[PDB]
Each structure stands twice: as structure tokens, then as C-alpha cells.
Design an enzyme around this catalytic site. Sequence first.
Site, PDB file in Angstrom:
ATOM      1  CG  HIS A  98     -33.364  -8.561  18.022  1.00 28.82           C
ATOM      2  ND1 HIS A  98     -32.689  -6.907  17.813  1.00 28.82           N
ATOM      3  CD2 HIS A  98     -33.234  -8.577  19.450  1.00 28.82           C
ATOM      4  CE1 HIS A  98     -32.314  -6.552  18.940  1.00 28.82           C
ATOM      5  NE2 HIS A  98     -32.400  -7.358  19.914  1.00 28.82           N
ATOM      6  CG  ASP A 105     -27.581 -10.036  23.845  1.00 26.94           C
ATOM      7  OD1 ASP A 105     -26.095 -10.148  23.358  1.00 26.94           O
ATOM      8  OD2 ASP A 105     -28.318  -9.222  23.520  1.00 26.94           O
TER       9      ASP A 105
HETATM   10  N1  LIG Z   1     -19.955  -2.313  20.615  1.00 28.25           N
HETATM   11  C1  LIG Z   1     -21.278  -2.126  21.016  1.00 28.25           C
HETATM   12  N2  LIG Z   1     -21.511  -0.825  21.817  1.00 28.25           N
HETATM   13  C2  LIG Z   1     -22.805  -0.250  22.399  1.00 28.25           C
HETATM   14  N3  LIG Z   1     -23.725  -1.121  21.776  1.00 28.25           N
HETATM   15  C3  LIG Z   1     -23.913  -1.883  20.936  1.00 28.25           C
HETATM   16  C4  LIG Z   1     -22.425  -2.355  20.563  1.00 28.25           C
HETATM   17  N4  LIG Z   1     -22.743  -3.750  19.936  1.00 28.25           N
HETATM   18  C5  LIG Z   1     -24.013  -4.048  19.862  1.00 28.25           C
HETATM   19  N5  LIG Z   1     -24.700  -3.032  20.422  1.00 28.25           N
HETATM   20  C6  LIG Z   1     -26.197  -2.690  20.617  1.00 28.25           C
HETATM   21  O1  LIG Z   1     -26.639  -3.164  21.971  1.00 28.25           O
HETATM   22  C7  LIG Z   1     -26.018  -4.528  21.814  1.00 28.25           C
HETATM   23  C8  LIG Z   1     -26.304  -5.266  23.226  1.00 28.25           C
HETATM   24  N6  LIG Z   1     -27.590  -4.565  24.398  1.00 28.25           N
HETATM   25  C9  LIG Z   1     -26.974  -3.554  25.214  1.00 28.25           C
HETATM   26  C10 LIG Z   1     -25.527  -2.858  24.856  1.00 28.25           C
HETATM   27  C11 LIG Z   1     -24.442  -3.733  25.697  1.00 28.25           C
HETATM   28  N7  LIG Z   1     -23.176  -2.816  25.590  1.00 28.25           N
HETATM   29  C12 LIG Z   1     -21.884  -3.250  25.057  1.00 28.25           C
HETATM   30  N8  LIG Z   1     -20.785  -2.734  25.540  1.00 28.25           N
HETATM   31  C13 LIG Z   1     -19.547  -3.082  24.929  1.00 28.25           C
HETATM   32  N9  LIG Z   1     -19.533  -3.983  23.772  1.00 28.25           N
HETATM   33  C14 LIG Z   1     -20.577  -4.549  23.135  1.00 28.25           C
HETATM   34  C15 LIG Z   1     -21.838  -4.076  23.791  1.00 28.25           C
HETATM   35  N10 LIG Z   1     -22.834  -4.728  23.229  1.00 28.25           N
HETATM   36  C16 LIG Z   1     -22.209  -5.485  22.347  1.00 28.25           C
HETATM   37  N11 LIG Z   1     -20.884  -5.345  22.226  1.00 28.25           N
HETATM   38  C17 LIG Z   1     -19.968  -5.968  21.363  1.00 28.25           C
HETATM   39  O2  LIG Z   1     -18.700  -5.076  20.708  1.00 28.25           O
HETATM   40  C18 LIG Z   1     -18.961  -5.987  19.388  1.00 28.25           C
HETATM   41  C19 LIG Z   1     -18.850  -5.512  18.043  1.00 28.25           C
HETATM   42  O3  LIG Z   1     -20.094  -4.950  17.820  1.00 28.25           O
HETATM   43  C20 LIG Z   1     -18.317  -7.266  19.965  1.00 28.25           C
HETATM   44  O4  LIG Z   1     -17.043  -7.145  19.982  1.00 28.25           O
HETATM   45  C21 LIG Z   1     -19.168  -6.964  21.543  1.00 28.25           C
HETATM   46  O5  LIG Z   1     -17.975  -6.684  22.311  1.00 28.25           O
HETATM   47  C22 LIG Z   1     -28.215  -5.488  25.155  1.00 28.25           C
HETATM   48  C23 LIG Z   1     -29.754  -5.197  24.888  1.00 28.25           C
HETATM   49  C24 LIG Z   1     -30.618  -6.438  24.568  1.00 28.25           C
HETATM   50  N12 LIG Z   1     -30.103  -7.865  25.234  1.00 28.25           N
HETATM   51  C25 LIG Z   1     -30.773  -6.536  23.206  1.00 28.25           C
HETATM   52  O6  LIG Z   1     -30.730  -7.630  22.705  1.00 28.25           O
HETATM   53  O7  LIG Z   1     -30.957  -5.416  22.642  1.00 28.25           O
HETATM   54  C26 LIG Z   1     -26.836  -5.117  20.825  1.00 28.25           C
HETATM   55  O8  LIG Z   1     -27.971  -5.487  20.710  1.00 28.25           O
HETATM   56  C27 LIG Z   1     -26.796  -3.552  19.802  1.00 28.25           C
HETATM   57  O9  LIG Z   1     -28.116  -3.321  19.404  1.00 28.25           O
END
Ligand SMILES: Nc1ncnc2c1ncn2[C@@H]1O[C@@H](CN(CCCNc2ncnc3c2ncn3[C@H]2O[C@@H](CO)[C@@H](O)[C@H]2O)CC[C@H](N)C(=O)O)[C@@H](O)[C@H]1O
Length: 273
Positions: free
Chosen positions: A17, A157
Site C-alpha cells: 500500500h 494481487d
Molecule cells: N492468508 C490471508 N488470508 C486472508 N487475508 C489475507 C491473508 N494474507 C493477507 N491477507 C489480507 O487480504 C490480502 C489480499 N486481499 C484479499 C484476500 C485474498 N485472500 C487470500 N487467501 C489465501 N491466502 C492469501 C490471501 N491473501 C494473501 N494470502 C497469502 O497468505 C500469505 C501469508 O500471509 C501468503 O502465503 C499468501 O498465500 C486482496 C485485496 C486487495 N488487493 C488489497 O490490497 O487489499 C492482503 O491485502 C491482506 O490485507
Amino acid sequence: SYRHSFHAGNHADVLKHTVQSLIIESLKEKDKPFLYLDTHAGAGRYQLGRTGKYLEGIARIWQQDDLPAELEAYINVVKHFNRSGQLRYYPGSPLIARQLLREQDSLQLTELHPSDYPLLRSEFQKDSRARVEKADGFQQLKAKLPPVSRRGLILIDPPYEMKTDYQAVVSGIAEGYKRFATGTYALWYPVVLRQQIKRMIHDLEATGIRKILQIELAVLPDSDRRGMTASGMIVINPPWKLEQQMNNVLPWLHSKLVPAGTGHATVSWIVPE
Ligand SMILES: Nc1ncnc2c1ncn2[C@@H]1O[C@@H](CN(CCCNc2ncnc3c2ncn3[C@H]2O[C@@H](CO)[C@@H](O)[C@H]2O)CC[C@H](N)C(=O)O)[C@@H](O)[C@H]1O
């Protein structure tokens, strides 16, 4: 009710961000409208919390009184959503874009997850600049480019839950790039297994695309056993100030996010001009 998230506002979010805000601030230097395209937009904002990765992320940044001037725009959006001074809400990338973009600019946001899409839609229900679609994000790099404005930041992302994400990002980048070759593409990636990232970067070089900058913040050294130890941003056609801006704030971010001094923080060219 807004989504709770254990990971929101973690060190990865701070870096991503930060970079998104600086790119946006650079594109605002010209009056003509631009598009903000978010291939994987999430919920929009996140209710925080003492547990939650934000304690080691934005919480260690947002009330520092030695804030580098490059973070002011980003931290100012976080403050906007926590006006009483208690860290309670973290804005996702669509909301950082919502607050920073001007009247003339446009937002195009996709989210597939049926729990997050309705939240994401209500965040722009009254915003005539924005469109929100329940669509696959990678397909948008074909269907939405070039923007009618012929200016843009595209944030790619994905979750990287499916290892195919590491190939889709690259082919999607090449798809959109052929169609909009002066756009700024920002790719967020995590470091879980370093071998994954070397392969993805090698595939990016294989496209031959030029002007690819890599910003990477690591809170621990590479490991085989510890999950995400680092994340990065890969920027195609970075604004000209971006590299010097990141050289200015990156050691600061690393200092505040990782007092023990583990890991690293680097700006380098994968592929120069
Ligand atoms: N593990 C997580 N689970 C849920 N939310 C998570 C996770 N990590 C970060 N976030 C938050 O949502 C994120 C992104 N967002 C929507 C949520 C997407 N879904 C996810 N599904 C499973 N695994 C995720 C996910 N996201 C990152 N991982 C990661 O797990 C990591 C270790 O952490 C790595 O191994 C990687 O696999 C996009 C919105 C937009 N582009 C923005 O920029 O907001 C991010 O921004 C953060 O805020």
C-alpha cells in the site's frame, strides 16, 4: 458488517500500500484522468483485532513522528479511517485508491469471493467513478485494457493459495502489457519458498518486457519452514521518482517493522529500460 481479518495491515500490506500510494501520487501529477484497476480487490476494509498481524505491521508505522514524507499520503488514508487515534480499521487497496484518486479518475475492481464481493460493492455504491465486478481478476488484464483514458495503475494481487497464481500473474502481465504498454503494473508477491519466486522472476524475464523494478521487504531470512518471510512489489513502468522514493523509505520501513534487523530490504532492477 465489515470483514475481520487476522492478516490485514501486516508488513506485506504496509509495503504494498506504500507502493500503491506513491504510484497513485505520481499519476496525479498530470491533469488527465487515469484508471485504477484492482484484479483481486478483497473486501475493501478490515476490522482489526491484542492479536492480529497488524501489531507487527501498520501499528508500528502509523503513529511514528519521524514519518518519511513519502508515506504521508498512505498513512493519511489509514488515519482517515481511524480518526479517534485507536487503530481499528485498515483500508484495503480499493479504499486507498478510493481516497487518493480524483474526481476525474476511474476505478475498476474485481473480487470473486462471494463473501467479500457484496462488501466491496457497497464501498462504491455511491461512487460514479468506480465499477465493481464479480469476475476473475486475471481475465480483466485482457478485457479492461487499454483504459479509455490511456493512463493507469493496474494492481495484480492474487491470493497465491493456488501455486498456478505464480504463472498466471506473469502471463496476465504479458497479456495486459501488449494492450497497454505505457501502463504501470504493480504485482504483489509473497516469499514462502524462495524457489517459487526465482521461477516467477525467470518467467518474467522470459517475456522480454522492459523496465521491471523489484521492491522487496523481508522480516526474516528465507526459510523452508516458516511460511511467508518476505513479500514484494514488482513494478512495470514505475514512475520515474519511484526508485529513489523507495531507496528513501525502505530502510525506514525495515527499521520500524523489524527492530531485530533480520531479513533485508532492497530495490533493484529485474529488467531495466
Ligand atoms: N492468508 C490471508 N488470508 C486472508 N487475508 C489475507 C491473508 N494474507 C493477507 N491477507 C489480507 O487480504 C490480502 C489480499 N486481499 C484479499 C484476500 C485474498 N485472500 C487470500 N487467501 C489465501 N491466502 C492469501 C490471501 N491473501 C494473501 N494470502 C497469502 O497468505 C500469505 C501469508 O500471509 C501468503 O502465503 C499468501 O498465500 C486482496 C485485496 C486487495 N488487493 C488489497 O490490497 O487489499 C492482503 O491485502 C491482506 O490485507
